[PDB]
Amino acid sequence: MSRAYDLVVLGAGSGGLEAGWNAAVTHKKKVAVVDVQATHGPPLFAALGGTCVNVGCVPKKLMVTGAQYMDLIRESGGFGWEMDRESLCPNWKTLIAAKNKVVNSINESYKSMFADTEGLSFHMGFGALQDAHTVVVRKSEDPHSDVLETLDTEYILIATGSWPTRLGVPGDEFCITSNEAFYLEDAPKRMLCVGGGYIAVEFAGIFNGYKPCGGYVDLCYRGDLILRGFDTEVRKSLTKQLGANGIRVRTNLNPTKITKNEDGSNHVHFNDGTEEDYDQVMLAIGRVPRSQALQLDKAGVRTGKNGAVQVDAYSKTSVDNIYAIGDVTNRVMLTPVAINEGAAFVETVFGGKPRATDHTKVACAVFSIPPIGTCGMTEEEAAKNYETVAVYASSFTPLMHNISGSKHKEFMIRIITNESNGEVLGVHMLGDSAPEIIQSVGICMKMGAKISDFHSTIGVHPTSAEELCSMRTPAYFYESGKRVEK
Amino acid sequence: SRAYDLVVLGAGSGGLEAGWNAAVTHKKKVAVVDVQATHGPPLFAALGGTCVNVGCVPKKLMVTGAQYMDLIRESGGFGWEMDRESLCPNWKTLIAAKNKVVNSINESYKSMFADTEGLSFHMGFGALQDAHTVVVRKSEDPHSDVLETLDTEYILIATGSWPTRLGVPGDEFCITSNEAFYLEDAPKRMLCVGGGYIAVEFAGIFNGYKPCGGYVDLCYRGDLILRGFDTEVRKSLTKQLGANGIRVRTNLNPTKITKNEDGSNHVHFNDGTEEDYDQVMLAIGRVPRSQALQLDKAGVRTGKNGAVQVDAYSKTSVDNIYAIGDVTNRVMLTPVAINEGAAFVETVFGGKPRATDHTKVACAVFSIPPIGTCGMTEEEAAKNYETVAVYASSFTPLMHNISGSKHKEFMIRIITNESNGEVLGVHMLGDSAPEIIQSVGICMKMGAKISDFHSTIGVHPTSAEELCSMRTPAYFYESGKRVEKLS
Ligand SMILES: Cc1cc2nc3c(=O)[nH]c(=O)nc-3n(C[C@H](O)[C@H](O)[C@H](O)COP(=O)(O)OP(=O)(O)OC[C@H]3O[C@@H](n4cnc5c(N)ncnc54)[C@H](O)[C@@H]3O)c2cc1C
Ligand SMILES: Cc1cc2nc3c(=O)[nH]c(=O)nc-3n(C[C@H](O)[C@H](O)[C@H](O)COP(=O)(O)OP(=O)(O)OC[C@H]3O[C@@H](n4cnc5c(N)ncnc54)[C@H](O)[C@@H]3O)c2cc1C
Ligand SMILES: CC[C@@H](C)Oc1cc(N)nc(Sc2cccc(Cl)c2)n1
Ligand SMILES: CC[C@@H](C)Oc1cc(N)nc(Sc2cccc(Cl)c2)n1
Ligand SMILES: CC[C@@H](C)Oc1cc(N)nc(Sc2cccc(Cl)c2)n1
Ligand SMILES: CC[C@@H](C)Oc1cc(N)nc(Sc2cccc(Cl)c2)n1
Ligand SMILES: CC[C@@H](C)Oc1cc(N)nc(Sc2cccc(Cl)c2)n1
Ligand SMILES: CC[C@@H](C)Oc1cc(N)nc(Sc2cccc(Cl)c2)n1
Ligand SMILES: CC[C@@H](C)Oc1cc(N)nc(Sc2cccc(Cl)c2)n1
């Protein structure tokens, strides 16, 4: 070859590694993977494995499974599990500790992958494009810093992911993000989760589980109803159920000023003009793509909306040899997608047989308490897009919650079909095991299954999922975008 | 002509569904016979069927109770500190809280018959007089007082099934699923006999509710528990019951039982061991419940232990008489009996005929941990289809590194036909396996292929996302022979 390495991957991400690994193993290419550190934690947070492994899907989910024990301990008494309810409070310390261990052992698990894989090489620093075939690595985030390596390559892949959006407000410095939340010293007593994204909610769940006895948690959204882009009816039942679990949801209310107090605590001036004191305050505003210092303009790769790399369906950028995936594109900011985008890139480029990722009918989930599983069109956007649609609903309280005493925990299902053909466009579920159920739904919808296939499949009694196969007569319809009965 | 357009013998999961549908969607005059209105002994079964009163409902509640044992224990790893000295639960407050819940269904159902015109409940022992008549009697003695005499166009037999006993000296001193539900106290020293889904579910329950110092033994005459399930699933489970403290015992059934001076039950074994247990449950299985209906009076046929002889549209030996659910002995699940009984209503009363699809029925075992399975076992698949490919994947969920239950391996095993890529079977052991499998059994109802499975996008992080990563078979079968690659 004319060059040194075949591939370079900026960012050792869920998407990045998958690509880098596959190219190196199934195609034996020489592949380098750049990231900013090897083990998780501050100051950089993200590390080997990506945002999902170090400060996302893994640690998050562990804490969520921790926070659930609050309910499950409480629920147990109804089935005759008697015990000391005076020791009401958990230990945040022993959770974070136990979490770190687990996340850490992945970073180990990955180091020895690069060691064990020939072709694959990890390169710790800040990746930056020199030109279309060269990638500078630097020790410091300052672009003028010491230059650590200079990688030469046929193809470049940008899997640098995304970074928390701040709100530019007086006192922003004193707030935290998803990233900092994971390495908090102690459990916040008086907590304020700002925003209404899936992060905002997941975390409100977590802190509400791990609050010290006497603490409370406030959610705070500028809009009307939390989690836009989800089935409104699901969003409401959830907004209630967070309430029922003790999360004080607050709407049409964002803060305007934050000021640190003489005892360390954070004082918050609000939208309406309220003043309040919280130990911590987290910003789940969202995530901007992480392209802001890579020097894309040096190479001729294009930025669009907040650095979103400009990319076609086969993941190719402005420059022919350069590609980009996952969160930096801003197509869909989930891992399984980024993995697939990065797998498809390897078959396209190195594997001969080209292919692009199918972004329709991607199932996904929110690990709130209780959690949501959704795949497909929201009923609002479905009736607007397709001419005639039929909306099926079903809410039931599981039989067990008569005994557990959590009668607030309504399991909900909402199927949204095209009426003409009977095809399932969307399925929306709130309740425990909704993330597990939905996956297998998203397979049915990948085939484009119809409501006939759903109800006319035999049941698995007793489950929550068996109420997919009973959904027969629509609760109501839409006729040309018009909320209709007939 | 007739005073009822249909009589149901047995207010069952299948029965009610049929009786309700005929009465409501078709406005027929329908009577439903059962032996009582509320749950409990001596009869156990009541309004709602075996599932509602002494099956899927109470069982599942107890299972959800028994889980709390693990979940309490597991919580400590995530920093849930508390008094572990009070190690033991309260069986009494569980049974109590269970009864309430099952009871409120029996209420829920009484007022259905009240609120539904056409629908009428008739408490007694149903018995065929002839092809159009159904005698109701107060006592189980066939010669007893005659309470009603129902006349009808069509008769449906949804009388379900009854626990198989083992004819052994001391059988009287044992219990069944039915009695288990109304036990006074939690058995300390317990012996679950057999290796059916009941046997296992219950071993799970008693092991959760044992007093501190008690133990639970499982006991099967065969090699490996739960025949008819994926062998590799059956083993990982047999280990995991062990790991939870259930002492599994194989090639060992008892031969004599004798009650002791302090009430307890003493058990002579297959191998010749002697042991003492507080209670001993028999999950041998369930024979159809046709043994006193006088089918021979009407000309309906019995076969293997009363199994009603029935065609695909659920029609029996006599044209106007039909039978469903457990009494047929096709598949002894509720969702099936419901569908068999729904299909019967469209066939007879609804004009448009239809028969129930017994292939690719998903189902589950609520062990701890539970199984979800739909389709062919790998053994029977390779024997039946020429070339098959078996995909496997066992992982330990990320959380069990912290909870300290590292024994809890979530397992998945897909079994395909290799020629076409079609998914014949899917087998899952682990928490949320029953919820996941339902949505699988929809894919397999369409006859989905392994291409559709792996090439669907993931829902990270779940157990179910490891269905959409299953790409290269661990091994194959070529004309019934265990092999890696072919020809
Ligand atoms: C709190 C949180 C929770 C989440 N939860 C879920 C969930 O439950 N389910 C789900 O499906 N998805 C979840 N996600 C989404 C998931 O993390 C991402 O969508 C996915 O990892 C995107 O892949 P990517 O390769 O584009 O970025 P990532 O996989 O995140 O890779 C980013 C990597 O690039 C490196 N990098 C960035 N810039 C540079 C540079 N200049 N030089 C060198 N290296 C660099 C970083 O150090 C990092 O390791 C979550 C995200 C967050 C933040
Ligand atoms: C412990 C246990 C657990 C179970 N768990 C599950 C599970 O988790 N999932 C699942 O799918 N299935 C389960 N089953 C199976 C389920 O209970 C039955 O297979 C199902 O209810 C069959 O429906 P059916 O209408 O045929 O009969 P059933 O619903 O069993 O109907 C029986 C009814 O008929 C009545 N009857 C009996 N004799 C007469 C007569 N001579 N005259 C009038 N009425 C009569 C009885 O009083 C009874 O109420 C379980 C069974 C048991 C015993
Ligand atoms: C009931 C709807 C009626 C009050 O109209 C509403 C309601 C609402 N919450 N926000 C608006 S406009 C709006 C948009 C973004 C942020 C905020 Cl605080 C308000 N209009
Ligand atoms: C202009 C708003 C900008 C600073 O970003 C913000 C501000 C805010 N209060 N909440 C969010 S999160 C958010 C709020 C409403 C709807 C949706 Cl979809 C997201 N983003
Ligand atoms: C097909 C679902 C339908 C039976 O509704 C449900 C769901 C559920 N979890 N429990 C019940 S109570 C119930 C009534 C009759 C038979 C059985 Cl097995 C259960 N009904
Ligand atoms: C109880 C009658 C005896 C002869 O037969 C037994 C004995 C026993 N321990 N378990 C059962 S139930 C059972 C045993 C093996 C395979 C299967 Cl599929 C079921 N039947
Ligand atoms: C392949 C091992 C070889 C001994 O075959 C085996 C093993 C076993 N446990 N039981 C049998 S026959 C058998 C069937 C029912 C009950 C009993 Cl105790 C034995 N054959
Ligand atoms: C046979 C492969 C099986 C063990 O899967 C593996 C392999 C491995 N090295 N780490 C894991 S850890 C893990 C944690 C949560 C979910 C899943 Cl699917 C896996 N699983
Ligand atoms: C792609 C492997 C995937 C299907 O298995 C799983 C499942 C799970 N719950 N956690 C993991 S750990 C992990 C490995 C790579 C990227 C990410 Cl985001 C997580 N792997």
CATH of the domain at B88: 3.50.50.60
Name every chain A residue with its beta carbon within 8 A of the beta carbon of B80. 66, 69, 73, 90-91
Give the residue from A453, A438, A299 showing the smallest Cα distance to A372.
A438
- Judge if the beta carbon of residue A286 lies within 6 A of ligand 1: no
Final residue before a domain boundary, out of A360, A389, A407: A360
Q: How far apart are CA A231 and CA A228, in angstroms?
A: 8
- For residues A122 and A59, state if they share a domain: yes
Q: Which amino acid is at B384?
A: N
Q: Is A269 a catalytic residue?
A: no
Name every chain B residue with its beta carbon within 8 A of the beta carbon of A373. 459
- Judge if the beta carbon of residue B253 lies within 6 A of ligand 6: yes
Give the residue from A476, A481, A482, A486 showing the smallest Cα distance to A233.
A476
Give alpha helix (H) positions in A334-400: 335-349, 379-385
- Judge if the beta carbon of residue A41 lies within 6 A of ligand 1: no
Chain A residue closest to B89 (CA)? A81
Residue A458 DSSP one-character state = P
- For residues A29 and A158, state if they share a domain: yes
User: Residue A42, exposed/middle/buried by CB under 10 A (0-12, 13-18, 19+)?
Assistant: exposed
Q: What are phi and psi of A121, to 5 degrees?
A: -140, 130
B79: its two tokens: 């920093």
CA distances (Å), origin B22, targets A342, A469, B347: 56, 21, 11
CA distances (Å), origin A12, targets A61, A103, A153, A155, B367: 21, 15, 17, 16, 41
Rg of chain B over all Cα atoms, to the nearest angstrom? 24
Measured between CB atoms, does B87 come within 8 Å of chain A? no
> How many structural domains comprise chain A?
3
Q: Which amino acid is at B19?
A: G
Distance B434 CA to ligand 5 centre (A): 15
- For residues A379 and A396, state if they share a domain: yes
Query: Residue B427 in contact with residue B415, Cβ under 8 Å?
Result: yes
Q: Whose CA is nearest to atom 12 of ligand 3?
A: A223
Q: Where do we find the tokens 């069927």?
A: B49
Torsion of the alpha carbons at B48, B50, B54 and B57, rounded to the nearest 10: -60
- Judge if the beta carbon of residue B19 lies within 6 A of ligand 2: no
- For residues A374 and A342, state if they share a domain: no
Measured between CB atoms, does B335 come within 8 Å of chain A? yes
Q: Where do we find the tokens 């024994």?
A: B407
Task: Please check if B373 is assigned to a binding site.
Answer: no
Query: Residue B290 in contact with residue B159, Cβ under 8 Å?
Result: yes
Query: Residue B427 in contact with residue B230, Cβ under 8 Å?
Result: yes
Final residue before a domain boundary, out of A254, A285, A316: A285
Q: At what angle do helices A198-210 and A232-244 cross, to 10 degrees?
A: 20
Q: How far apart are CA B199 and CA B193, in angstroms?
A: 7
- For residues A5 and A139, state if they share a domain: yes
Binding region of A for FAD? 14-16, 35, 47, 51-52, 57, 60-61, 127, 160-162, 198, 327, 335, 461
Task: Please check if B377 is assigned to a binding site.
Answer: no
Measured between CB atoms, does B442 come within 8 Å of chain A? yes
Taking residue A261's Cβ as centre, other Cβ atoms within 10 Å add up to: 10
The parent domain of residue B246 ranges over 164-284
Query: Residue A106 in contact with residue A53, Cβ under 8 Å?
Result: yes
Helices (H) and strands (E) in chain A, counts: 13, 23
Q: At what angle do helices B56-75 and B91-115 cross, to 10 degrees?
A: 140
Q: How far apart are CA A394 and CA A376, in angstroms?
A: 18
Residue A174 DSSP one-character state = G
Q: Whose CA is nearest to atom 17 of ligand 2?
A: B51
Interface of A with B in 262-301 (CB under 8 A): none
Can you name the residues that pair with A9 across neighbouring β-strands? A33, A157
Query: Residue A427 in contact with residue A450, Cβ under 8 Å?
Result: no
Distance A102 CA to ligand 9 centre (A): 13
CA distances (Å), origin A403, targets A76, A406, B69: 9, 8, 16
Final residue before a domain boundary, out of A304, A327, A360: A360
For A127, the enclosing helix (H) or strand (E) is strand A126-129
Residue B216 DSSP one-character state = E
Three-class SS state of B286: strand
Three-class SS state of B77: helix
Chains A, B: CB contacts under 8 A, how many? 265
Give alpha helix (H) positions in A303-378: 335-349
Residue B435 to residue A465, Cβ atoms within 8 A: yes
User: CA angle at residue B64 from B58 to B70, to 5 degrees?
Assistant: 150
Q: How far apart are CA A307 and CA B280, in angstroms?
A: 69
Up-side HSE of residue A189: CA atoms within 13 Å toward CB?
9
Taking residue B278's Cβ as centre, other Cβ atoms within 10 Å add up to: 19
Give the residue from A224, A142, A178 showing the smallest Cα distance to A60.
A178
CA distances (Å), origin B48, targets A188, B17, B105, B106: 50, 10, 8, 7
Please provide the DSSP assignment of A229-295 as one string. Answer: TS-HHHHHHHHHHHHHTTEEEE-S--EEEEEE-TTS-EEEEESSS-EEEESEEEE-S-EEES-TTS-
Q: How far apart are CA B268 and CA B275, in angstroms?
A: 7
Residue A439 to residue B464, Cβ atoms within 8 A: yes
Residue A458 to residue B437, Cβ atoms within 8 A: no
Q: What are phi and psi of B84, to 5 degrees?
A: -85, -5
Q: How far apart are CA A283 and CA A221, in angstroms?
A: 10
Q: How many residues does chain A have?
A: 486
Q: Where do we find the tokens 């110092």?
A: B213
Query: Residue A457 in contact with residue B460, Cβ under 8 Å?
Result: no
Q: At what angle do helices A434-447 and B433-446 cross, to 10 degrees?
A: 10
Interface of A with B in 28-57 (CB under 8 A): 52, 57
- Judge if the beta carbon of residue B308 lies within 6 A of ligand 2: no
Q: How far is CA B42 from the centre of its chain?
A: 21
CA distances (Å), origin B299, targets A169, B161, B316, B348, B471: 86, 21, 9, 20, 55
- For residues A183 and A239, state if they share a domain: yes
CA distances (Å), origin B126, targets A78, B139, B198, B314, B373: 38, 10, 27, 19, 36
User: CA angle at residue A324 from A320 to A327, to 5 degrees?
Assistant: 160
Terminal alpha carbon distance of chain A: 67
Distance A430 CA to ligand 8 centre (A): 27
Q: Whose CA is nearest to atom 15 of ligand 7?
A: B222
- For residues A99 and A5, state if they share a domain: yes
Measured between CB atoms, does A92 come within 8 Å of chain B? yes
- For residues A277 and A349, state if they share a domain: no
- For residues B330 and B407, state if they share a domain: no
Chain B residue closest to A100 (CA)? B402
Q: Whose CA is nearest to atom 38 of ligand 1?
A: A160
- Measured over the CA atoms of residue A266, residue A269, residue A270 and residue A275, the dihedral's sign is positive
Residue A362 to residue B457, Cβ atoms within 8 A: yes
From B166, B221, B251, B253, the mutation candidate for ligand 6 (largest count of ligand atoms within 8 A of CB) is: B221
CATH classification of the domain holding A377: 3.30.390.30
CA distances (Å), origin B469, targets A336, B396, B413, B424: 11, 16, 12, 18
Query: Residue B140 in contact with residue B124, Cβ under 8 Å?
Result: no
Q: Which atom of ligand 9 is nearest to the CA of A50?
A: 18
Q: Which amino acid is at B242?
A: G
Three-class SS state of B484: coil
Please provide the DSSP assignment of B158-196 as one string. Answer: ---EEEPP---TTGGG-B-HHHHTT-SS--SEEEEEB-S
- For residues A414 and A340, state if they share a domain: no
Interface of A with B in 144-203 (CB under 8 A): none
Three-class SS state of A183: coil
Q: How far apart are CA B104 and CA B107, in angstroms?
A: 5
Q: Which residues contact A142 (CB under 8 A, 6 or more apart)?
A: none
Q: How far apart are CA B222 and CA B233, in angstroms?
A: 16
What method did the depositors use to determine the structure? Answer: X-ray
Three-class SS state of B456: coil
Residue B453 DSSP one-character state = H
Taking residue B87's Cβ as centre, other Cβ atoms within 10 Å add up to: 13
Name every chain B residue with its beta carbon within 8 A of the beta carbon of A364. 459
Query: Residue B390 in contact with residue B374, Cβ under 8 Å?
Result: no
- For residues A151 and A300, state if they share a domain: yes
Three-class SS state of B427: strand
- For residues A406 and A468, state if they share a domain: yes
Strand order in the sheet with B265-269: B254-259, B265-269, B274-277
Query: Residue A357 in contact with residue A337, Cβ under 8 Å?
Result: yes
Up-side HSE of residue A85: CA atoms within 13 Å toward CB?
9
Interface of A with B in 194-253 (CB under 8 A): 210
Judged by phi (left if over 0) then psi (alpha if -120 to 50, else beta), residue B476 lies in beta
Strands A190-194 and A216-220: parallel
